[PDB]
């Protein structure tokens, strides 16, 4: 009965179990690294892992693929927006 | 008298003999460069909103964007020489060029 | 209203050919009018006699549905096009494929031939058309710009030289040399699967489940509607006498007057014995070269031939 | 004294609900003929433009105005946020589902197989 | 005034540059205006159907 | 909680690469594009939001939720003129979708630009839209007094939609505001317009009610 209860409750794709575990698994990797990275650079050594990733900074450095809005019959020049 | 506020222009006008830079009815002053594209107007005084759909395109583009493009033209005529294919000589020219 | 439409006599079915083993999807007539050719979803191409209705020959090269055939007026060639992404050139003095045009990325939905120069145009489901050079099998242009399968293509000698209708409900008129769209017509609300050009009038018509529309070359200025046929319309076909045949996908076929747009007959044929009634549908129609017979290729694996009725008059069948 | 009623029906098209909402919002607004006449005496004949007739470059709004439309924006946004009324987590009835996706699929099946 | 002369190509020389680069496709053309006929209504009963 | 600059920037990077891979993955259903732009606006990085909406409209411009979310985003952030350019592009390319005209006019009314709202209503009526649009225009003219404009609109209206019911509404309008001679003229024009071969009850019923 317990094992029948076991089988009937496992709806998530048996791999959909695993990768669900993996998503929370790696959060150790990043969470551990950062504090240890914080502490490492806090100890006074500015380690670089290395810089080689082709499309990574395509997100946080620049507008990924920028399309600026078209202009029409009105002046958009003076508009500017606040910060967070 | 040296006109400084455009009210002194009455209906408008610059005083060429008056040694002042006349700015009559918003005249004279170079303004900020704004983004607004040229609010054009047709050959009858209508507001040619064809512009904003034609955004950044040649004049070869035929752009249907008016209501009058939807209305059934009354071309129930078997006769009009408006619609008859180009004479085969022009077709021969197009064929050679192509 | 309108002046009143010309009287055309009505058409009656007089022959039913059945030898295919899958839907019949395309049909064409030879230049010299002796035989016609059908391509079907059983991957054969059959060649029938037009007088007797006898089957002359069966060509089997494709790997899937043959979705278009055409016979060239300048050379002894038959060009066929399938869902296997391949386009073929059959030479009709040996009955064998001599040339194949490669490069489409999904099924090819239709194909037409240029009447003066030797090029081919094909439309496919990758939402492009291509202009092929008949002689060197090289793709000289990829007409791209639609955003969904390109249901149909027709080409002409005048200008613009290519009209394509696609499933993203748009028509485009292209120039052959430059290779880009001059005009985009977005009047239809549903996929445009049918386009036809008037033989002698510099106008054309485009069919959709909403209604057929007429347009006027060379920049496609709207002319009028033709409404009443509420069905997925697979074909349009125009006679030289202004009869326009609109064949739908539930089997029903309307016959219209081209000039005034007056629907003067509605044919609702019957399905072959062993067929279901959910399997009545017209995929292609073609007028004879004499423009006397009208052949239709149907989803119940038959070819139905209609001829005009000779014993009727304006007072037997008046025009409403 | 006044009286009226408006009953809800099928969502038939998104247009119908949009239109109802516009009706409500329109009825709410109250315009100041003061500012209208003030704006009027400045511009006169420009007030009555056809689609194609007249043109003045741009009308620049006092910020205080802009706040009105922003506030109405936030209001309509909230009212829209409440579109779907949720039915409270009732455990009282028999459980055959294994997760909330399965529970909702079973509910859709209940509507279509009676 | 300048004299253009085209430099000889070495017969035995392989291609020089990497051709295969992938990028997403550009923006299309300016969207054309949708010239439809006005929409009609679907009753609740039809959506039931 | 994110202490500061580098940690929330990594947080940005992770969410951002997640969004961008979703978009690369499907490039279609616009739930992804809208989720993404909603987030980049919630962080008040609205230039990225504008780029996202623009790219989305490049994917599928016939989608009306996209246009509405976009103009809403511009309007909340007080970018009035951006919102105006957007409404203008929208009613230019999708002129049959009525929501756009409604909301454009409503905004311009809130903002106090009544001349602008009339400009938009006129452009709209060029398309001969539908009775509800004409009603909306007339009600707009009636929140302000401008009753002569209202009857001008009604003249165009009953020609565009020649139904007996509309002629009735027109007459009813002018009587409610006490122009009795004019309402009589309306009724006589109605009868002479329709002609016998169609003419039926409802019209006469209302005509009798008026004269009674």
UniProtKB/Swiss-Prot annotation, chain A:
Residues 49-55 are annotated as: Required for interaction with CTNNBL1. A motif (Nuclear localization signal) lies at residues 14-84. Ubiquitously expressed in both fetal and adult tissues. Phosphorylated on serine and threonine residues. Has no effect on subcellular location nor on homodimerization. Phosphorylated in vitro by CDK2. Phosphorylation enhances interaction with PPP1R8. Residues 1-84 form a coiled coil. The modification Phosphothreonine is found at residue 76. There is a cross-link at residue 68 (Glycyl lysine isopeptide (Lys-Gly) (interchain with G-Cter in SUMO2)). It is found in: Nucleus; Nucleus speckle; Cytoplasm. It is linked to A chromosomal aberration involving CDC5L is found in multicystic renal dysplasia. Translocation t(6;19)(p21;q13.1) with USF2. Homodimer. Interacts with DAPK3. Component of the precatalytic, catalytic and postcatalytic spliceosome complexes. Part of a spliceosomal 'core' complex consisting of CDC5L, PLRG1, SPF27, CCAP1, CCAP3 and CCAP6. Interacts with PLRG1, Lodestar/TTF2, and NIPP1/PPP1R8. Component of the minor spliceosome, which splices U12-type introns. Within this complex, interacts with SCNM1. Component of the PRP19-CDC5L splicing complex composed of a core complex comprising a homotetramer of PRPF19, CDC5L, PLRG1 and BCAS2, and at least three less stably associated proteins CTNNBL1, CWC15 and HSPA8. Belongs to the CEF1 family. This is Cell division cycle 5-like protein. It comes from Homo sapiens. The lineage of its organism: Eukaryota, Metazoa, Chordata, Craniata, Vertebrata. The chain holds residues 152 to 235 of 802 of the full protein.
Swiss-Prot record, chain D:
Abundantly expressed in the heart, skeletal muscle and kidney. Expressed at lower level other tissues. Transmembrane segments: none annotated. There is a cross-link at residue 30 (Glycyl lysine isopeptide (Lys-Gly) (interchain with G-Cter in SUMO2)). It is found in: Nucleus. Belongs to the SYF2 family. Identified in the spliceosome C complex. Interacts with CCNDBP1. Involved in pre-mRNA splicing as component of the spliceosome. This is Pre-mRNA-splicing factor SYF2.
Curated annotation (Swiss-Prot), chain E:
It is found in: Nucleus. Residues 14-38 are annotated as: Disordered. The modification Phosphoserine is found at residues 29, 37, 39. There is a cross-link at residue 45 (Glycyl lysine isopeptide (Lys-Gly) (interchain with G-Cter in SUMO2)). This is SNW domain-containing protein 1. Involved in pre-mRNA splicing as component of the spliceosome. As a component of the minor spliceosome, involved in the splicing of U12-type introns in pre-mRNAs. Required for the specific splicing of CDKN1A pre-mRNA; the function probably involves the recruitment of U2AF2 to the mRNA. May recruit PPIL1 to the spliceosome. May be involved in cyclin-D1/CCND1 mRNA stability through the SNARP complex which associates with both the 3'end of the CCND1 gene and its mRNA. Involved in transcriptional regulation. (Microbial infection) Is recruited by HIV-1 Tat to Tat:P-TEFb:TAR RNA complexes and is involved in Tat transcription by recruitment of MYC, MEN1 and TRRAP to the HIV promoter. Belongs to the SNW family.
Swiss-Prot record, chain F:
Widely expressed. Highly expressed in testis. Not detected in brain and lung. HAT repeats lie at residues 10-42, 44-76, 78-110, 112-143, 145-176, 178-212. It is found in: Nucleus; Nucleus speckle. It comes from the Eukaryota. Belongs to the crooked-neck family. Involved in pre-mRNA splicing process. As a component of the minor spliceosome, involved in the splicing of U12-type introns in pre-mRNAs. Identified in the spliceosome C complex. Present in a spliceosome complex assembled in vitro containing CRNKL1, HPRP8BP and SNRPB2. Component of the minor spliceosome, which splices U12-type introns. Isoform 2 seems to be predominant in the spliceosome complex. Interacts with PPIL2 (via the PPIase cyclophilin-type domain); they may form a trimeric complex with HSP90. This is Crooked neck-like protein 1. It comes from Homo sapiens (Human). The gene is CRNKL1. The chain holds residues 213 to 424 of 848 of the full protein.
């Amino acid at each position: 009965l317990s094992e029948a209860r076991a089988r009937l409750a496992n709806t998530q794709g048996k791999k959909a179990k695993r990768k669900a575990r993996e998503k929370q698994l790696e959060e150790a990797r990043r969470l551990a690294a950062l504090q240890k990275r914080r502490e490492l650079r806090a100890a006074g050594i500015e380690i670089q892992k290395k810089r080689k990733r082709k499309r990574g900074v395509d997100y946080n450095a620049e507008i990924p693929f920028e399309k600026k809005p078209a202009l029409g019959f009105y002046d958009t020049s003076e508009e500017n927006y606040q910060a967070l | 008298w040296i006109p400084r506020l455009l009210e002194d222009f009455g209906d408008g006008g610059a005083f060429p003999e008056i040694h002042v830079a006349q700015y009559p009815l918003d005249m004279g002053r170079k303004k900020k460069m704004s983004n607004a594209l040229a609010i054009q107007v047709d050959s009858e005084g209508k507001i040619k909103y064809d512009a904003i759909a034609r955004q950044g395109q040649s004049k070869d583009k035929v752009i249907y964007s008016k209501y009058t493009d939807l209305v059934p033209k009354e071309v129930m005529n078997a006769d009009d020489p408006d619609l008859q294919r180009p004479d085969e000589e022009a077709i021969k020219e197009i064929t050679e060029k192509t | 209203t309108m002046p009143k439409p010309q009287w055309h006599p009505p058409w009656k079915l007089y022959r039913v050919i059945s030898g295919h083993l899958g839907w019949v999807r395309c049909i064409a007539v030879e230049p010299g009018n002796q035989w016609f050719v059908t391509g079907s979803a059983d991957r054969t191409i059959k060649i029938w006699d037009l007088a007797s209705g006898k089957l002359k020959l069966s060509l089997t090269g494709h790997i899937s549905t043959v979705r278009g055939v055409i016979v060239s007026t300048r050379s002894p060639y038959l060009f066929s096009c399938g869902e296997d992404k391949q386009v073929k050139c059959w030479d009709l003095e040996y009955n064998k494929v001599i040339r194949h045009y490669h490069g489409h990325l999904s099924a090819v939905y239709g194909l037409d031939l240029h009447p003066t120069i030797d090029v081919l145009v094909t439309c496919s489901r990758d939402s492009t058309a291509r202009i092929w050079d008949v002689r060197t099998k090289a793709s000289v242009h990829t007409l791209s710009g639609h955003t969904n399968a390109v249901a149909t293509v027709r080409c002409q000698a005048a200008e613009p030289q290519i009209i394509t209708g696609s499933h993203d409900t748009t028509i485009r008129l292209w120039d052959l040399v430059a290779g880009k769209t001059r005009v985009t017509l977005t009047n239809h609300k549903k996929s445009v699967r049918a386009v036809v050009l008037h033989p002698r009038h510099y106008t054309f018509a485009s069919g959709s489940p909403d209604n057929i529309k007429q347009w006027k070359f060379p920049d496609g200025s709207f002319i009028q509607n033709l409404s009443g046929h509420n069905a997925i319309i697979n074909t349009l076909t125009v006679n030289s006498d202004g009869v326009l045949v609109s064949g739908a996908d539930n089997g029903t076929m309307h016959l219209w007057d081209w000039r005034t747009g007056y629907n003067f007959q509605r044919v609702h044929a019957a399905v072959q014995p062993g067929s279901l009634d959910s399997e009545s549908g017209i995929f292609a129609c073609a007028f004879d070269q004499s423009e006397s017979r009208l052949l239709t290729a149907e989803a119940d694996k038959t070819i139905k031939v209609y001829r005009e009725d000779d014993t009727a008059t304006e007072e037997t069948h008046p025009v409403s | 004294k006044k009286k009226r009623k408006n009953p809800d029906l099928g969502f038939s098209d998104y247009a119908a609900a949009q239109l109802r909402q516009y009706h409500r919002l329109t009825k709410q607004i109250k315009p100041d003929m003061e500012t209208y006449e003030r704006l009027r005496e400045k511009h006169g004949e420009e007030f009555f433009p056809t689609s194609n007739s007249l043109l003045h470059g741009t009308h620049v709004p006092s910020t205080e105005e802009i706040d009105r439309m922003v506030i109405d924006l936030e209001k309509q946004i909230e009212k829209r946020d409440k579109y779907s009324r949720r039915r409270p987590y009732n455990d009282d009835a028999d459980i055959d589902y294994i997760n909330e996706r399965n529970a909702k699929f079973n509910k859709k099946a209940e509507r279509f197989y009676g | 005034v300048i004299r253009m002369v085209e430099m000889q190509k070495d017969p035995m020389e392989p291609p020089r540059f990497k051709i295969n680069k992938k990028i997403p496709r550009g923006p299309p053309s300016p969207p054309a205006p949708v010239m439809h006929s006005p929409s009609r209504k679907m009753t609740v009963k039809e959506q039931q159907e | 909680k994110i202490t500061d600059e580098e940690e929330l920037n990594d947080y940005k990077l992770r969410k951002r690469k997640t969004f961008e891979d979703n978009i690369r993955k499907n490039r279609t259903v616009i739930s992804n594009w809208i989720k993404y732009a909603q987030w980049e606006e919630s962080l008040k990085e609205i230039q990225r939001a504008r780029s996202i909406y623009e790219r989305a409209l490049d994917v599928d411009y016939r989608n009306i939720t996209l246009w509405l979310k976009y103009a809403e985003m511009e309007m909340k952030n007080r970018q009035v003129n951006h919102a105006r350019n957007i409404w203008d592009r929208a009613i230019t390319t999708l002129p049959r979708v009525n929501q756009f005209w409604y909301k454009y006019t409503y905004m311009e009314e809130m903002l106090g630009n009544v001349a602008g709202a009339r400009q938009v209503f006129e452009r709209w009526m060029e398309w001969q839209p539908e009775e509800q649009a004409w009603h909306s225009y007339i009600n707009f003219e009636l929140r302000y007094k401008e009753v002569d404009r209202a009857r001008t609109i009604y003249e165009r209206f009953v020609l565009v939609h020649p139904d007996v019911k509309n002629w009735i509404k027109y007459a009813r309008f002018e009587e409610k505001h006490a122009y009795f001679a004019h309402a009589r003229k309306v009724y006589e024009r109605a009868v002479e317009f329709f002609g016998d071969e169609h003419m039926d009850e409802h019209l006469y019923v209302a005509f009798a009610k008026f004269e009674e």
